[PDB]
Design an enzyme around this catalytic site. Structure first.
Site, mmCIF file in Angstrom:
data_model
loop_
_atom_site.group_PDB
_atom_site.id
_atom_site.type_symbol
_atom_site.label_atom_id
_atom_site.label_comp_id
_atom_site.label_asym_id
_atom_site.label_seq_id
_atom_site.Cartn_x
_atom_site.Cartn_y
_atom_site.Cartn_z
ATOM 1 C CG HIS A 60 57.867 55.090 59.401
ATOM 2 N ND1 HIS A 60 58.619 56.233 59.106
ATOM 3 C CD2 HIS A 60 58.412 54.082 58.682
ATOM 4 C CE1 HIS A 60 59.506 55.917 58.181
ATOM 5 N NE2 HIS A 60 59.354 54.633 57.864
ATOM 6 C CG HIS A 90 58.667 62.714 56.898
ATOM 7 N ND1 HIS A 90 59.891 62.797 56.301
ATOM 8 C CD2 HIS A 90 58.857 62.858 58.223
ATOM 9 C CE1 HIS A 90 60.792 62.959 57.263
ATOM 10 N NE2 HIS A 90 60.175 63.003 58.449
ATOM 11 C CG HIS A 92 57.656 63.158 62.885
ATOM 12 N ND1 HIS A 92 58.086 61.862 62.970
ATOM 13 C CD2 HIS A 92 58.442 63.748 61.994
ATOM 14 C CE1 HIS A 92 59.216 61.726 62.242
ATOM 15 N NE2 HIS A 92 59.419 62.855 61.592
ATOM 16 C CD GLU A 102 60.357 63.216 65.179
ATOM 17 O OE1 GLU A 102 61.128 63.536 64.293
ATOM 18 O OE2 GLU A 102 60.140 62.005 65.507
ATOM 19 C CG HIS A 115 61.018 66.430 59.965
ATOM 20 N ND1 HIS A 115 61.081 65.281 60.772
ATOM 21 C CD2 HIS A 115 61.035 67.512 60.789
ATOM 22 C CE1 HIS A 115 61.168 65.710 62.017
ATOM 23 N NE2 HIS A 115 61.160 67.045 62.079
ATOM 24 C CB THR A 194 63.802 61.849 64.378
ATOM 25 O OG1 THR A 194 62.767 61.738 63.382
ATOM 26 C CG2 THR A 194 64.441 63.199 64.428
#
Ligand SMILES: [Zn+2]
Length: 255
Positions: A60, A90, A92, A102, A115, A194
């Protein structure tokens, strides 16, 4: 769970009912409604002794993991009581530059969001810390597409070696100071992970200043795969959860 139409954020509540809880993340940050809080102590990002170990494609995102077996890289101050150790970071990101973050800022979506995850050392280990309302502190940093971020390129150049789920590579001697913007001005609110299990254990600290990365840098993020080696290729893009209801929460500004 994942980010597809059949297993994405609108499905997560069936396995993780806290998905519809009172302190979910991310949220939209309404800059006009966030209030300056003069009581916020100064924020302290102490990364000079950070010890990176490995980079992993977990299906992911990719995570850069740290040695957290002593107080090397820590976050303190701001809204935090006590000492939070860096364990992983990491991102997103989107399929397109107009989406990927996010958190949003007055409904503006950034191309990506970093993050940096820290855990409260008073709980002794990460697994215990995620069971506490003050267990984690996540430092969130927006990415916009512009000039290259030199401190990101070592991450970009290793992504070819972890293309698919379950791949890892040694990633020692990476300095996470090179991912920070100039300013540490931030917003803060109580929220959650999240991704599943969506635990309500996070003090979010979102920096106001985004960092700039190049189109070529974020193109390389979008070449990763969600799938395992030898499975049908699914590009790792749009691995972001949309903004969640604010409910009974106040977002505080440090500035
Ligand atoms: Zn995240």
């Amino acid at each position: 769970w994942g980010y597809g139409k059949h297993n994405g954020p609108e499905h997560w509540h069936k396995d993780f009912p806290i998905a519809k809880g009172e302190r979910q993340s991310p949220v939209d940050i309404d800059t006009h409604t966030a209030k300056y809080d003069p009581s916020l102590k100064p924020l302290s990002v102490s990364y000079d002794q950070a010890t990176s170990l490995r980079i992993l494609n977990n299906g992911h995102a990719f995570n850069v993991e740290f040695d957290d077996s002593q107080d090397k890289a820590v976050l303190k101050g701001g809204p935090l009581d006590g000492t939070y150790r860096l364990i992983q970071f990491h991102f997103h990101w989107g399929s397109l530059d107009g989406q990927g973050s996010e958190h949003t800022v007055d409904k503006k979506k950034y191309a990506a969001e970093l993050h940096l995850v820290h855990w409260n050392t008073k709980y002794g280990d990460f697994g215990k810390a995620v069971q506490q309302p003050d267990g984690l502190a996540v430092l969130g940093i927006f990415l916009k597409v512009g000039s290259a971020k030199p401190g990101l390129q070592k991450v970009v150049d290793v992504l070819d070696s972890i293309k698919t789920k379950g791949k890892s590579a040694d990633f020692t001697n990476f300095d996470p100071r090179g991912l920070l913007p100039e300013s540490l001005d931030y917003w803060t609110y109580p929220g959650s992970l999240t991704t599943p299990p969506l635990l309500e254990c996070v003090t979010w600290i979102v920096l106001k200043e985004p960092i700039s990365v190049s189109s070529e840098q974020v193109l390389k993020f979008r070449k990763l795969n969600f799938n395992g080696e030898g499975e049908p290729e699914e590009l790792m893009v749009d691995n972001w959860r949309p903004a969640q209801p604010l409910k009974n929460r106040q977002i505080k500004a440090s500035f």
